[PDB]
Design a protein around this ligand. Structure first.
Ligand code: HEM
Length: 154
């Protein structure tokens, strides 16, 4: 997977919109993930018992998780694929400690796209959607390779 400078600039332009409200994007993205793929909520011992969207929006623990994933992913995207140093410790923790299947990184990727389109449709058109899909596929491909280096095929 390879992105053009142009495709990287589309990614960073929409990420600028995420950064106008990091915590609120984090909430929307994790709630979409948990509503669309409930099994993923079981991975978060601090908030796996939340059953409603209102309880999810009121949760400090969920809000903090949302900021964690979006600050990390923003930093990775700003590397424009030169993200070996960021992905190594992410693969280590998500493969060996959190036990997150590659399939769940595919789910949260879909949740990111869904929220970007829901919140920013005047801006997140077909070119932005294509470029972001390419950037999240590169992320998936590279972290999947790291998982295999650690002895996890999925
Ligand atoms: C774009 C995808 C993701 C990124 C960038 C990301 C990033 C992070 C970071 C930076 C941390 C804290 C440092 C660390 O433990 O490595 C973390 C913790 C964690 N992540 Fe993720 N993550 C992602 C996807 C997921 C998914 C899909 C799940 C579960 C379905 C997950 C579960 C967790 C858990 C359980 C922790 C531990 C949280 C805690 O200590 O309270 N992550 N993630």
């Amino acid at each position: 997977m390879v992105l053009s400078e142009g495709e990287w600039q589309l990614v960073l332009h929409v990420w600028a919109k995420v950064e106008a409200d990091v915590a609120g994007h984090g909430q929307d993205i994790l709630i979409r993930l948990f509503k669309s793929h409930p099994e993923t909520l079981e991975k978060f011992d601090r908030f796996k018992h939340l059953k409603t969207e209102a309880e999810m929006k009121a949760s400090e623990d969920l809000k903090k998780a949302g900021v964690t994933v979006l600050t990390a992913l923003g930093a990775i995207l700003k590397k424009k694929g030169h993200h070996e140093a960021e992905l190594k410790p992410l693969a280590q923790s998500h493969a060996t400690k959190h036990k997150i299947p590659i399939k769940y990184l595919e789910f949260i990727s879909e949740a990111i796209i869904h929220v970007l389109h829901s919140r920013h449709p005047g801006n997140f058109g077909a070119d932005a959607q294509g470029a972001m899909n390419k950037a999240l596929e590169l992320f998936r491909k590279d972290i999947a390779a790291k998982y295999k280096e650690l002895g996890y095929q999925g």
